[PDB]
Design a protein around this ligand. Structure first.
Ligand SMILES: Nc1nc2c(ncn2[C@@H]2O[C@H](COP(=O)(O)OP(=O)(O)O)[C@@H](O)[C@H]2O)c(=O)[nH]1
Ligand SMILES: Nc1nc2c(ncn2[C@@H]2O[C@H](COP(=O)(O)OP(=O)(O)O)[C@@H](O)[C@H]2O)c(=O)[nH]1
Length: 400
């Protein structure tokens, strides 16, 4: 059922690898070969120069679930490879880099390069393990790449339904027309609110436990790119809030924090700043998430919600330029000497982004053990200072 496509410039070994991993034609779509302990289909993306590559790459992006991006290890990273990379940056779908005929290979921006040969199949196992890892994550409900998917999570009666209705009643919104989701456009950009049916579960059904609701909310998070954590401004923070937000964070989702029912809070001039500080104290892992105060009832600041979801989604998807990234890391090291360890100092050689959603970075070092968590946080904050990344977690991995 999973679909795999091989993409790259001419003469990197695509046919050779394709013919090896493919079995019989289905009816172009081929099933995977007998010798493979993986079950999946292959799509042939046969079809100027840039125009022809783009044609192939876009077919893969539409029809496949995982893409193998193949380069030629004998010819190094060519300018034409860098061009294919740029096209492939346009997809959210998993891309695995295979370096055939066996760096700067990390410089392509897709993380670990998998060395292979089409002669005697060296490296194939590891490559196929890496592709197959993605299968479990393939979305059950698929939407066009352009659609931004988000969810609202929060305890019962916080105002999720009311926020959604307040949000959808805006002049900028056109509600459309899988019947669990709600589709709409906002400034003509397409959005999906994941599993609105679960919010409307009440009125048809009694809630006799929250355990299934919690688990259903986790599924909605898995399907979303942005998660709006809605808190009740009247009752304050509770443990269930921390737990579901922690899940979102660990799942690498973009997060926006929404304080609803602000109309009902007895305010002085510092009631908002105190609430904000109370949130930062209870959700110490969500420093990147903006906090929004609104009222679904009076509509106060309702108009700020969609722009915050857009911004978090943008930052979640943000791909940085490598040369700039390295300048930022060297500036960081310049201002703050690296940790030492009984005579051995951490040295940083090179940094690159390896994925998006969330933004993930690899730092090439001396030895990863000398990279302490506190220095890692420091690097993260310097990256945030230079590029923004408001609304999204980021990941930093040290490698030797
Ligand atoms: N040395 C070596 N040559 C290869 C390997 N894989 C493919 N080739 C050769 O490279 C050329 C391009 O192969 P092909 O599969 O047509 O690549 P495509 O143009 O990307 O489909 C052919 O002459 C192949 O015989 C490999 O692993 N090692
Ligand atoms: N005062 C006030 N009440 C609200 C607000 N939003 C929702 N409510 C009320 O809180 C209750 C629960 O709202 P609902 O949208 O069903 O919350 P849900 O369980 O998260 O969907 C309803 O009686 C709403 O009218 C708000 O901004 N201010």
């Amino acid at each position: 059922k999973p679909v795999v496509a091989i993409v790259g410039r001419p003469n990197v070994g695509k046919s050779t690898i394709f013919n090896r991993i493919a079995g019989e034609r289905i009816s172009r779509i081929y099933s995977s070969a007998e010798w493979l302990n993986y079950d999946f289909n292959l799509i042939d993306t046969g079809g100027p120069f840039l125009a022809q590559i783009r044609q192939q790459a876009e077919i893969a992006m539409d029809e496949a679930d995982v893409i193998i991006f193949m380069v030629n290890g004998r010819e190094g990273v060519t300018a034409a490879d860098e061009e294919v990379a740029k096209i492939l940056y346009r997809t959210k779908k998993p891309v695995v880099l295979a370096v055939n005929k066996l760096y700067d290979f990390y410089s392509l921006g897709f993380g670990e390069p998998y060395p292979i040969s089409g002669t005697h199949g060296l490296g194939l196992g590891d490559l196929l393990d890496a592709v197959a890892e993605h299968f479990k994550n393939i979305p059950e409900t698929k939407y066009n790449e352009e659609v931004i998917q988000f969810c609202l999570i929060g305890r019962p009666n916080v105002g999720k339904s009311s926020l959604v209705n307040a949000m959808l009643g805006e002049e900028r919104v056109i509600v459309s027309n899988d019947a669990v989701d709600t589709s709409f456009t906002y400034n003509q950009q397409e959005f999906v609110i994941v599993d609105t049916a679960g919010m409307r579960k009440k009125g048809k059904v009694y809630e006799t436990t929250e355990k299934y609701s919690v688990l259903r909310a986790l599924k909605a998070i898995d399907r979303s790119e942005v998660v709006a954590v809605v808190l009740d401004g009247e009752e304050g923070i509770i443990e269930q809030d921390k737990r579901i937000a922690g899940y979102a964070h660990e799942a690498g989702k973009a997060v926006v924090i929404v304080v609803n029912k602000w109309d009902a809070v007895d305010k002085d001039e510092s009631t908002m700043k105190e609430f904000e500080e109370n949130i930062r104290d209870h959700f110490q892992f969500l420093d990147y998430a903006p906090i929004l105060f609104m009222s679904a009832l009076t509509k106060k600041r309702i108009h700020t919600l969609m722009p915050a979801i857009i911004k978090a989604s943008e930052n979640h998807s943000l791909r940085v330029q490598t040369n700039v990234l390295n300048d930022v890391i060297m500036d960081a090291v310049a201002m703050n000497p690296t940790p030492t360890h009984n005579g051995s100092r951490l040295k940083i050689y090179y940094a690159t982004q390896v994925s998006v959603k969330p933004p993930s970075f690899v730092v090439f070092v001396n030895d990863p053990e000398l990279m302490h968590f506190s220095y890692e946080r420091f690097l993260e904050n310097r990256i945030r200072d230079a590029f923004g990344f408001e609304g999204t977690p980021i990941k930093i991995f040290a490698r030797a």
